[PDB]
Structure formats: C-alpha cells, structure tokens
C-alpha cells in the first residue's frame, strides 16, 4: 500500500556520460561528489561512482531537444531537470550546457547547488515551499549550507 516513487535498493550508482567544457572534469567530478555527499549524510543511502551506462543516475549534458522531449532552452530559464526513481531514463539528471558553469561565484550558475537540487529529484523528492530550503524551485546562490529542515524531512521519510 505504500507509494512514492523511489529506489527499491540503498546503494545507488552514478555516471557521469560527458563533460560541459565550462570546468575542468576534476572539478564537475568534485562537484557532482559534493552533491551526492550532502544527501548521503542524511540517508541510510549510498551513491558509487560508476563508468557504466547501467548505472541508476545517468548524468548528461546537453542543449535544446536532447532526446527526452523536455527540451532545454538556451541561456537561463530551465538551468536543468532530472527524473523520479525508476529504469532507464528514470532517475536520470540532465544539465543546460547552454548555460555557463561554475562554482557559482561572479558569473554562472552553481553546478555543486544545481546538481545538489537536481539529484533531490532523482531520489524522488518534489519541491519545498520553504524559500531557505535547496529543494524550493528557484535558483539563489549561496555559500552556506543548502539543506533545510524541509529537505532532510523529505529525503529521510523515503528513506529512513
Ligand atoms: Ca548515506
Ligand atoms: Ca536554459
Ligand atoms: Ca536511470
Ligand atoms: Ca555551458
Ligand atoms: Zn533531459
Ligand atoms: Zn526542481
């Protein structure tokens, strides 16, 4: 009788498929670990970083129509989306190549905050109504802490 979309096993696995060219790969790496590690210290979850295309989390980027029907937009606007739990396509997180990445400070977007907020998605959670919590559908740069009450209530009532 239970029902939320969500990953029936505890250690979920991610791929990184390619690479925007606004940062080095070490640092969109960092970045995506970053991301996963804010969610893990809350959750009985694991996330391993895998070279596979079976993995449960595919990471891409990509501009415009990119095979999923929810096309991207160019700069600003849609910065990125990412599917509920599931197979396949499910799960997977998408990032706006045509928007400018990087660590979030003087120009561009954070992908550490967008991807953070991204793979909230991913692990099944819908957006907060709290403007202070990472899971509120708008983009606000930060250097603190991005979790809210709100986001590890979410995240934990799935999970644990
Ligand atoms: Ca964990
Ligand atoms: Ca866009
Ligand atoms: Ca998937
Ligand atoms: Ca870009
Ligand atoms: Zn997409
Ligand atoms: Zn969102």
Redesign the pocket.
Known sequence: FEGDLKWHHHNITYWIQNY???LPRAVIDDAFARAFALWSAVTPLTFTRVYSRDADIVIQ?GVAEHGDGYPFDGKDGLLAHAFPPGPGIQGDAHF??????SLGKGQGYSLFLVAAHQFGHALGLDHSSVPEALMYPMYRFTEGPPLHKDDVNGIRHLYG
Do not use: A, G, P, V
Request: charged fraction near 60%.
């Open positions: 925007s060219e606004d980027f706006d190549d045509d928007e400018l990445w």
